[PDB]
Each structure stands twice: as structure tokens, then as C-alpha cells.
Paper text:
It generates NADH during oxidative decarboxylation of pyruvate, alpha-ketoglutarate, branched chain ketoacids, and glycine contributing to the production of high energy molecules and metabolic intermediates. While the metabolic function of Lpd is ubiquitous, Lpd fulfills an additional antioxidant function in mycobacteria, including Mycobacterium tuberculosis (Mtb), a causative agent of tuberculosis (TB), and provides electrons for the detoxification of reactive oxygen and nitrogen species. Lpd in Mtb is required for virulence and persistence in mice and is a genetically validated TB target.
Therefore, we synthesized methylated analogues of Z1765676493 and Z819807984 at the analogous position, leading to 1 (TDI-13537) and 2, respectively. Gratifyingly, the potency of both 1 (TDI-13537) and 2 improved by 15- to 20-fold to sub-micromolar levels in one-step optimization. The binding affinity of TDI-13537 is consistent with its enzymatic potency (KD = 0.241 μM compared to Lpd IC50 = 0.16 μM). Intrigued by the absence of a hydrogen bond donor on the novel core of the two best hits and their corresponding derivatives, which we thought was necessary for potency within the sulfonamide series based on previous SAR, we then characterized the binding mode of TDI-13537 in Lpd by X-ray crystallography. The only inaccuracy in the docked pose was toward the solvent-exposed region of the compound, where the orientation of the terminal acetamide group was flipped to the other side of the phenyl ring. The compound occupies the lipoamide binding site and forms all the expected protein–ligand interactions. The sulfonamide moiety orients the central amide’s carbonyl group to form a hydrogen bond with the side chain of Arg93, which was previously found to be a critical residue for Mtb over human selectivity. The terminal phenyl moiety stacks with the Phe99 side chain, and the acetamide-NH substituent interacts with the Phe464′ C-terminal backbone carboxyl group.
Numbering used by the authors:
A (entry chain B), B (entry chain A): 1 to 464
Write the structure that this text describes.
Amino acid sequence: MTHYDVVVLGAGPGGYVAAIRAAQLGLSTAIVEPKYWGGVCLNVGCIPSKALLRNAELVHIFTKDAKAFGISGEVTFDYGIAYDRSRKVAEGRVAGVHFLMKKNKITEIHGYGTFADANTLLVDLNDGGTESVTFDNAIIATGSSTRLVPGTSLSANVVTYEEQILSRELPKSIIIAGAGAIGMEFGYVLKNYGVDVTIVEFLPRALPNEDADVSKEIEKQFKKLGVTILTATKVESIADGGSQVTVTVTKDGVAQELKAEKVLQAIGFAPNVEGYGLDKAGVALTDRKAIGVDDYMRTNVGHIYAIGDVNGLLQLAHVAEAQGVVAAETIAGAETLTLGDHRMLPRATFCQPNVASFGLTEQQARNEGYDVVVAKFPFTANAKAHGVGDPSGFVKLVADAKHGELLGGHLVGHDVAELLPELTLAQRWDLTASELARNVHTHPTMSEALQECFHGLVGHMINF
Amino acid sequence: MTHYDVVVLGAGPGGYVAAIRAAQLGLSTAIVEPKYWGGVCLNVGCIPSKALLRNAELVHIFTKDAKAFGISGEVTFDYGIAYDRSRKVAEGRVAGVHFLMKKNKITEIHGYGTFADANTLLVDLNDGGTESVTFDNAIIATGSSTRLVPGTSLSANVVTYEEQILSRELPKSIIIAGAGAIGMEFGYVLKNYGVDVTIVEFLPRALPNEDADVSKEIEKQFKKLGVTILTATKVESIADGGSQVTVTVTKDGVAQELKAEKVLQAIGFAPNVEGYGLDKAGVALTDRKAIGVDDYMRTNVGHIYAIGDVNGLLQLAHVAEAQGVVAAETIAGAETLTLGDHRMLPRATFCQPNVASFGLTEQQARNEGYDVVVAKFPFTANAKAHGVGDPSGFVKLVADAKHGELLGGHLVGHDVAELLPELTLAQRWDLTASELARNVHTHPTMSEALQECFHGLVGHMINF
Ligand SMILES: Cc1cc2nc3c(=O)[nH]c(=O)nc-3n(C[C@H](O)[C@H](O)[C@H](O)COP(=O)(O)OP(=O)(O)OC[C@H]3O[C@@H](n4cnc5c(N)ncnc54)[C@H](O)[C@@H]3O)c2cc1C
Ligand SMILES: Cc1cc2nc3c(=O)[nH]c(=O)nc-3n(C[C@H](O)[C@H](O)[C@H](O)COP(=O)(O)OP(=O)(O)OC[C@H]3O[C@@H](n4cnc5c(N)ncnc54)[C@H](O)[C@@H]3O)c2cc1C
Ligand SMILES: CC(=O)Nc1cccc(NC(=O)CN(C)S(=O)(=O)c2cc(C)cc(C(F)F)c2)c1
Ligand SMILES: CC(=O)Nc1cccc(NC(=O)CN(C)S(=O)(=O)c2cc(C)cc(C(F)F)c2)c1
């Protein structure tokens, strides 16, 4: 029944960063994790997927663009080597998490935690033992799990991201349920490695959380890649027949069968809230079955916090880390700053072209009553995008007309995920388009498209 | 004869942007240019060089990283096709400038302008003949020319960037005089296309304007590429023997002869100040033979401005454009913002890894009496850099300890030229390290390294 100021449940990006921050602030800290040090993100998520996406991008270059770059010769690509590299990358970063745990003198507890009451955690140790731990504060960082299409089940040929990303061998053909970031990214990797890919989306646009202009562009790019995207299409049932999987869908009010060797379920993620005594701690769930929190990540139990995907606010790694910092700082009574409207946080999808966005879409800002101004600059007017060989896409900024404060930003193009920091910095610290347009951007860079958008928000664009 | 509110001399990025902004402000504008619409940058500079650099980077990726990416096959690369694409990119961007001039109702005058007095310009027209233009304001935007090693001359095998970048065929070997951005970029392109490359630099490090830690890292990567860099070495003579060029260099009083098929002179650029009647307009030069200007780009003649490389302040394209906007706004009496100390402006070099920086180096900040705080984050601790396959390099931020105000930032790594905007926005609008550390950066991106540097400036890094 050892005692810690802080016990962290789960060691994904939210949990292990919260534990570092608590340790930095002088708090005795323990973190409890049975399986994934670094969580989903480092083991089977962000880290390995970005390695596989880079490999896929190089296939797409040394295949579709070789002639235009003066590259000649018969090239072959081996997905197994891409897989192997992704696992070595993941393993190196996981070893990093353990290094940081030791550097900060955080106690690792290798097992699964169940609450006995608001201040007691019982742990089933990976070695078979059972141990108890008490705490002054708890940080729940237990993540989310894949949501299955209602009525369907997993099987040999019907998999979540986890089994798919851990496969060294690819199928001949796949059907991906869900056109969010995960489904689109897997579609990009598999199609470039020669898998027939169909992506099925219930809403009428791929990447339906994005601005509709962005959805339209990414649909066009994926069609050119040879991916079939079926939008406004409901998956009714999934039947694993062994040698093929049959997906029954409704589209245009008509039931139709699609067949493939494999099916990836990627329709969303549900917070992990069952099976570890949240009820014994007294912790309340929202109507959506996420752990409710306030702006300081506090649950309804004042000394128990919930960070990362388990609160369902914005299920991304940098959000989990930032929420972990807020919780640790709030526990310690240190100066913190809350995150505010989580819609303003940045996010990206790492197919090529990238999609990167923050804040409100143009349609959302109009619906919420802002006096909306929009500036859109296409990368066909950017010198760097032509030099790199990919002038597709654009930057679209949405601002409020009273002072030119930013409401959102929507980017699609080559490597645009790196371009968000200046925009979220301005939004957070109340710099307007008039201040942003005076910030000189290096030439020739993709980032010059930001500066032309600022000009268009305040007056007239120059190089457009 | 014909009269304009504003006449712009030269149509590089400085001139043609100044003319657009003057036009936007309602001033009747003409722009005089004999040869390069888009100037050096769009025709023989930034635009085609970044196209060649992308081709070279794809050679490097296959050549050194093919095996690790699972790519097999005997591949050849044809520099001729890189060359052809660089010209097509340049020609499209020049057509763009012409579209912008007509969209903004700017009069193009196709010829070479000479001042007759402080309000009259004589134009020798390309189509034969002479026209006289009078003006109320003039913007001199006449650029710079290559400085040669004293006593040397151009010949068939001794060239500037202009003849070299217009060459469709490559030599077997080359000596590059000067390890500035231009010399390093050509060295990167030519070495990747199989040329034996030696770069000779008078100062004791390559990219000597950069922070010494950045120079050390780029020298290391170039040595791994196989480029010989000779630092603290003075070129004293260049003798073109037709079949070979002999370059005599000295270091520590010892002389040595270097031989190669070709020599590229890239030791610097001198403002263009002779031969177009500056004396007749009354415009004064600095001791270094640049046109002297104040903070609003005005020469000693109050209604004559000088922008871009001809004022020698910081000979970069985005600087020329920014100075053009200031000059045009000042002429019109519009609200403007001076650029201040030009050392704070951003700059980048586009070999791989990129180098990108702004502001003071750590040593310059120490020498000027700041209370210097430094934070350095290596890309070996960045998840995106490992996924991309290039974890080399770092981000190094220099701040003042009183409030955490940024003094400079120095980046070397994969595609880091895109990461400067947040740093220069914060420096310009007085956001300190403690405001920057709260800006959430998307995961996994190279930009997360910025956020970790902010944490180190205000406290302790988390993921390092
Ligand atoms: C394929 C894929 C790609 C992704 N790519 C990105 C991307 O590029 N960028 C991005 O920002 N996000 C990405 N994500 C999302 C990202 O993985 C999650 O947002 C992130 O991992 C959430 O972190 P977390 O700490 O909240 O939870 P998790 O990383 O899910 O970690 C929670 C941990 O809690 C442990 N746990 C659960 N219950 C208990 C218990 N009772 N006791 C002890 N431990 C317990 C689990 O074992 C798990 O390791 C991706 C996700 C997937 C699936
Ligand atoms: C190989 C190379 C690569 C470069 N890469 C980059 C890069 O990546 N990023 C960057 O920011 N900078 C880069 N530069 C520098 C960039 O090219 C210059 O800073 C930029 O061109 C300066 O713009 P400017 O308008 O001052 O002058 P210029 O572009 O030199 O244009 C001046 C124009 O004035 C005209 N002119 C001269 N005298 C007269 C006259 N009397 N009458 C009429 N017209 C006249 C000339 O014909 C010319 O077209 C590079 C330069 C080179 C050589
Ligand atoms: C002093 C010293 O040697 N320290 C050291 C040693 C070994 C490893 C590490 N650090 C890592 O391994 C960093 N990783 C854990 S990470 O997956 O790259 C990652 C993950 C996340 C969520 C966010 C980032 C963000 F920072 F980019 C990076 C530090
Ligand atoms: C409404 C409409 O149809 N407009 C249109 C049509 C055709 C072309 C263009 N514009 C260009 O071609 C832009 N170029 C000239 S540029 O070389 O790319 C360039 C150069 C510099 C110095 C800086 C940038 C910076 F913006 F990135 C870009 C506009």
C-alpha cells in the first residue's frame, strides 16, 4: 500500500508527460501501465504510422513522378522493409519514454490498475502479483479503443488499426470503414504499396471534420491516386467469409455488396471507461461515455483528473500531452493556462498532400454568427511548391471582420502540417491579421502562402 | 514626356512588389526593366535553384537511403531533365509577374533606365529608341552583381551562378569559391549529380554568418556527402588553362594549387550602382558602395528610395519585397512599419539538411551584453524526424533572461526553413518564451522541437 503524491493511470503521451511534469514540480509520482509505454501513439499509432507514410510517399515519388524528375530504371519496393523500419522506429521511441521515466525518478508500475475507492488503486501486476497503492491525486490517462460498426465483430480478416499496423504482409484488396484521418492514412499507405483500396464514409465528404473545401481537394487527390471513396454510404454489415470479406452498404437508398480480402474498421474511438473501477472512485461520465472534466482536467472528484483520449475532447497526442501538463500544474498549485475551446487546437493528417487545420471551418464560423472574412491562396502561386514538384492545394484562413482576429485555418498541400504554429500562436495571444501580415516570411517557402493570406484578410494579396 | 506618380527601376522581387503595392495605394506606376521580369530570383536565382535542389535531394534519397527504405533497382538520374524542369518552373513564374503587372494596371517599360536629373528618367528601349519619363517618386530596385575574386576574370571555365545555373551539362570536377548559401547549394546539387566538388572559404567556417554550432553541423553533413570544404583558406589566383583551371589558395602562409574542370565564383554580391546616372539624380552611396537609405528606404534625395539588394542591407528576396512595401506605403502616406534591425529578419539555405535562422547568434548576443539563455533540442528526440528518416540537426534558441524575449533562433535539419514564422512573429510583437511554451504544436511534426526549446528557455524540457 505504498503512497505517492500522484499516481498516473496509463503511460501514453498524456500519462507519461503528466508524470514528467508532476516530477519536475517536486511531486512523488508513480505511473501504472500493463502494455504500452508511450501508449497507442508510440507503439501502434502516430510514430509507426508516420514512418510507414514516409515510405509510401517515396514509393509515390519514385513511381508516379520518376520521369518528371529524370529518374529512370526499374524500381521495386518491399513493404516488409517499411514494416521493419516502422517497428524499429517505434521501439527506439519507447526506449526513450523509459529513459525519461528514470531521468525524472518516476516509479514505473508494470500492471493494470483498478480503483478500490477515491484514494486507492489495486494493481494486477504483469508478474502475476497484486498490489495496492494510495495517492493524494490521480491522473486518469487510459486512452480510447476502436469503435466497431454496430452489429459487426473482429475476426481474421476484419481488423482494427492495431492488427493492420502490426502486419508485415499486405492483402490484395481492402475495404476501410471510415474516412477520417486514420482511414485516409492507411488508404494512402496501402494504395501506394499496390493494394486495391475502397474507403466507405457515412457522411457526404471524406475528412468530414475538415472545411468542405479541404474535403473536396483531398477527395480529388485520392481519386488521382486510384483510391475509391464512397461517401454518403452506410456500412450495414460485415461478413468474414475466410477467402473474402463481404461488406453490405446502403448508398442512394440501395443496398449493395462490396468484396475485399480484408476490412479495416476505423469509424472512431470510444474512451476506455469500463472495467477498472471508475464507479468505486466516484468518477462521473458524460452522456457520450467520456470522463467529464472541467478546464483544469478535474473530474467531479476534486483530486482525480482525466487527460487524453479518455475525456473525448480532441483525441490527439499533443492534446493529451498539453492536458497532462495542465493537470500536473493544477495539482502542484503552479501557474498554468487552460486550453479553452478545444476546437481552436491544431490537428493534421499525414497523407500527401497533408491536411492541417485549427479552429472553425468557414461554414461553422458563419453558422455561429461571426462577421466572416475569408482569404484563400493556392500553392500554384507559390514558388517553393513548384520547385518541390507539388503545387496542389491551398491555404484558407477564416477571420472575424471586427478586428481581423483568426477564427480558423485550413491547409492542404505538401508538408503543410509544419505551418500551423504561427497561426495558433496569433489566435491564442490575440494577434490579428494586421500584425500577422507584417511578419516577413522567408522566400521561397510554403509558409509564404500564410503571409499572402494575411494580406488578403487585411486588404489585397500581392503575389496573387 | 509621360509622367507617373511612381517609377520603379528594376523588376526583381523588390521592384515588382513595390509597384504592386504602389498601385494598390492608388499611385500611377510604371516599372522599367530590360531583361529579367522577376529579376535574378525568378529567372536565375531562388526559383530555379530550389527546383534543382529538390532534384538533387531525390538523388540523395535513392543513392544513400534506398536500401533502408526497401527500394531496389538500378536507377540512373539525368541532370538534363533537372535542368529542363528548373527552366519550365522559372518561365511559369515570370509569366506570373507579367500577369500581376497587368492585373494591377502597372505600365511595363521594356528597356534600361538612366537618371537625367532627380525627376527624369531616360529609357533606352529594347525595341530601339529612347523615351523620357518624369516622376514624382522613384524606387531604385536595380539589384546586385557577382563580386569576383580580385584580379580574376570570367571565361569558358570560370563562371558565376548565372552561367552555371543555365548549364544543362555538368563538369567532372569544380572548385567553388565561397561557402555562403549559394556556394553551398550549388555544391550540394553538383555533388549529388556526381561532380567532384571542393569549396574554398576565406573565413574559418562554412556558412560563416550562421551560429557556429550550425556551421559545425553543416560542415559535418557535407563531409559525409563527400564535398571537400577548405575553410580559413584564401583564393589568390584563378588561371583558366582551357583543359583545366588552376586555383592557387593559401592557408597559414602555405600555398597550394587546386585543379578542376571548372570554377564557380560565389564570394559575394556588389550592389549595382554604376552606369545609370545616380550622380545626375544626386543619390549618395555608402562607403561599401551600396545606395544609402534610412529606415523608410529613402535615399538622401527625399523622393528617391532604394530597395532590395542595391542597398546591401540583407540581400534576400523576401527582404527586397518587404522593403518595397515600406517604400510604397511611405510614398503614399499609408500606415507602415519599418523593418528595424535587419539582423532579426529570417533567412534559410536549402541544401539538405536545411539551415534556417533569424536574429543574433549566441556569441553575438553575448558580445552585445544580453543576459543570454540558450535552449537546444536535437532532432534525435523528435518522433517525426525519425519517421522521415533524418533525425540529424537541432533547434537552438537564444533568449534574454529578464523576460525570456527571443534574440535569435538557429535551426539545422530536415525542411526546417518552414519553421521560422512563429519565432519571428513572437520576436516582432513581444511574445516571450513563456507565451510561446503554451502554444500547442501538432504531433508528430518537426515543429514540436520549437515547443521543447520554449520549455527549456522557461524551465525544463519535457521530452528531452
Ligand atoms: C493508427 C493511429 C495513428 C495515429 N496518429 C496520430 C497522429 O499522427 N497525431 C496525433 O496527435 N494522434 C494520433 N493518433 C492518436 C493518438 O494515438 C492518441 O491521441 C494518443 O495515443 C492518446 O494518448 P493517451 O495518453 O490519451 O492514450 P493512449 O496512448 O491510448 O494510452 C493509454 C494507455 O493507458 C493504458 N491503460 C488503460 N487502462 C489502464 C488501466 N486500468 N491501468 C493501467 N493502464 C491502463 C493502456 O494500456 C494504454 O497504453 C493516432 C492513433 C492511431 C490509432
Ligand atoms: C543562385 C541564387 C539563388 C538565390 N536563392 C535565394 C533564395 O533561396 N532566397 C532568397 O531570398 N534570395 C535568394 N537569392 C537572392 C535573390 O535572388 C535576391 O536577393 C533578389 O533577386 C533581390 O531582388 P531585387 O529586386 O533587389 O533585385 P534583382 O532580382 O537583382 O533584380 C534587379 C533587376 O534590376 C534590373 N536593372 C538593373 N539596373 C537597371 C536599370 N538601370 N534600369 C532598369 N532595370 C535595371 C536588372 O535587369 C534586374 O532584373 C538567390 C540569388 C542567387 C544568385
Ligand atoms: C538528455 C537526453 O539524452 N534525453 C533523451 C534521451 C533519449 C530519448 C529522449 N526523448 C525521446 O525519445 C522523445 N520521445 C519519447 S518521442 O517519441 O520522440 C516524442 C514523443 C512525443 C509525444 C512528443 C515528442 C516531441 F518532443 F517531439 C517526442 C530524450
Ligand atoms: C488572381 C490570379 O489569378 N493571380 C495569379 C495568376 C498567376 C500567377 C500568380 N502569381 C505568381 O505566379 C507568384 N509568383 C510571381 S512566384 O514566383 O510564385 C512568387 C514570387 C515571390 C517573390 C514570392 C511569392 C510568394 F507568394 F510565395 C511567389 C497570380
